[PDB]
Amino acid sequence: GNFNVAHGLAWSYYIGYLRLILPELQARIRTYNQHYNNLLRGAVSQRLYILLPLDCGVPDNLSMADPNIRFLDKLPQQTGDRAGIKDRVYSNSIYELLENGQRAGTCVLEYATPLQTLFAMSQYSQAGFSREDRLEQAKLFCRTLEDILADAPESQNNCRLIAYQEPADDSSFSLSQEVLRHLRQEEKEEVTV
Amino acid sequence: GNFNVAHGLAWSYYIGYLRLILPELQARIRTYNQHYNNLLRGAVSQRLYILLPLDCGVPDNLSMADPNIRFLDKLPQQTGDRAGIKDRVYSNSIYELLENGQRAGTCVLEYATPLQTLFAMSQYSQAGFSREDRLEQAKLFCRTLEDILADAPESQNNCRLIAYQEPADDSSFSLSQEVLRHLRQEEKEEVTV
Ligand SMILES: [Ca+2]
Ligand SMILES: [Ca+2]
């Protein structure tokens, strides 16, 4: 009947990952920026950027999606020293966004992994899950996840969703520019607020 | 409207975990049994047993749920030697089931982790998710997961679901006996088939 896998995938993504990772994020980014400012006179944005390609195409390397999205460094962990608070090994990567080979921006960036599940499901024949179903569930994942963060205790403030449909008329996208767009708007806000 | 997180949680559990772990399971259990037979003259069942406590109570140690469910050993990995096939570090534990301090059975056993998500959601007030909602979604998780394995290419044959509601009239359960029940029925089948 009313089957919507995106509901559980979004809730699970929030409860089992974002809720755990986001509280400590700002401090880990600050404590890295004290050095990144000193070294390269740059600054890493404080929000986790989440890629949500509506086509559910998740590469295992970001740079293969865009040579202007370049791995810079690993974001180090939290400092409390037993169990965690919820500091375990989650790897978070910092990327520099390029324009003409020059650095135009810098952020912690990653794909929302539950879209891989939607892709794998569309390739699993016994699921009866078409590419049109997949797209519909991708959009519903985004909207569900958005609603969740709207009522979340500044988990909202800790991350930014970047959903995008790509040309099937098949110009190339610029993911780096889409991301750069968000980073610049974010800085505008932080400085006019 | 029709909100059912259990659908995505079950699909995600199957696609992102069970589908990957189950194909190699029998061989890893055989290749361990060649030794376990030789050592203790015992035998580890070939099916992955999945605990689905409908109360969504997942302890981080099985023996705290039952002193008659005792950790025996780690099941070693697959043998192919780069990337995986999908052999990564997933830890699978072998437990001996006890009766009067004696070994009555032996199996790879674990909790279906997505029930933790349902528990965490019931404790998250902004989710508007009651304990009655949680129970309803636990049952729906089980049924959804069952239907999936029914059409699965002997993923069905590789695992066994053990769902249980516990006394709220509050006698104690015996989880070890519930599990032992399944192991004995499984052996009966294997030997009458
Ligand atoms: Ca793509
Ligand atoms: Ca329990």
Are residues A63 and A34 part of one domain?
Answer: no
Reading the block at residue B135, the tokens are: 């129970």
* Ligand 2 midpoint to CA B181 (Å): 18
Instruction: Scan for tokens 């390397």, then name that residue.
Output: A61
Ligand nearest to the CA of A56: 1
Are residues A16 and A82 part of one domain?
Answer: no
Reading the block at residue A47, the tokens are: 């929000």
Are residues B123 and B56 part of one domain?
Answer: yes
Classify strands B159-164 and B48-53 as parallel, antiparallel or unpaired: parallel
Number of domain units in chain A: 2
CA distance B66 to A34: 50
CATH of the domain at A3: 1.20.5.5200
Ligand nearest to the CA of B65: 2
Contact present, A127 and A49 (Cβ < 8 Å): no
Dihedral (CA of B130, B135, B138, B139) sign:
negative
Q: Strand runs (DSSP E) across B43-191, as ranges? A: 48-53, 69-75, 92-99, 102-111, 159-164
CA distance B71 to A20: 29
CA distance A80 to A188: 33
CA distance A74 to A93: 5
Backbone interruptions in chain B following residues (C to N > 2.5 Å):
none
CA distance A183 to B12: 32
CA distance A71 to A103: 12
DSSP helix/strand/coil, A107: strand
Are residues B131 and B59 part of one domain?
Answer: yes
Dihedral (CA of B96, B99, B101, B102) sign:
negative
Beta bridge partners, A176, equal none
Interchain pair A15, B124: CB under 8 A: yes
* Ligand 1 midpoint to CA A6 (Å): 19
Are residues A53 and A73 part of one domain?
Answer: yes
- Residue B62's identity, in one-letter code, is L
Q: Phi first, then psi: what are they for B69, rounded to 5°?
A: -105, 100
CA distance A88 to A80: 11
Are residues B71 and B29 part of one domain?
Answer: no
Are residues B176 and B187 part of one domain?
Answer: yes
CATH of the domain at B93: 3.40.50.12100
Q: How far is Cα of residue B10 from the mean position of the Cα atoms in its chain?
A: 13
Are residues B55 and B123 part of one domain?
Answer: yes
Are residues A91 and A5 part of one domain?
Answer: no
Domain that holds residue A3: 1-44
Are residues A84 and A32 part of one domain?
Answer: no
Are residues A49 and A39 part of one domain?
Answer: no
B8 → closest Cβ in A12, A116, A151: A12
Instruction: Scan for tokens 């025996």, then name that residue.
Output: B72
Whose CA is closest to B65, among B55, B57, B56, B54? B57
* Ligand 2 midpoint to CA B125 (Å): 22
Q: What angle do CA B37, B41, B42 make, to 5 degrees?
A: 75
Q: Which residues of B touch A4 (CB under 8 A)?
A: 2-4, 7-8
- Residue B187's identity, in one-letter code, is E
Element (H, E) at A11: helix A5-13
Resolution (A): 2.2
Are residues B88 and B59 part of one domain?
Answer: yes
Considering only alpha carbons, which residue of chain A is nearest residue B118?
A12
Strand B92-99's sheet: what is its strand order? B69-75, B92-99, B102-111, B48-53, B159-164
Q: Dihedral through CA B53, CA B54, CA B59, CA B60, nearest 10?
A: 70
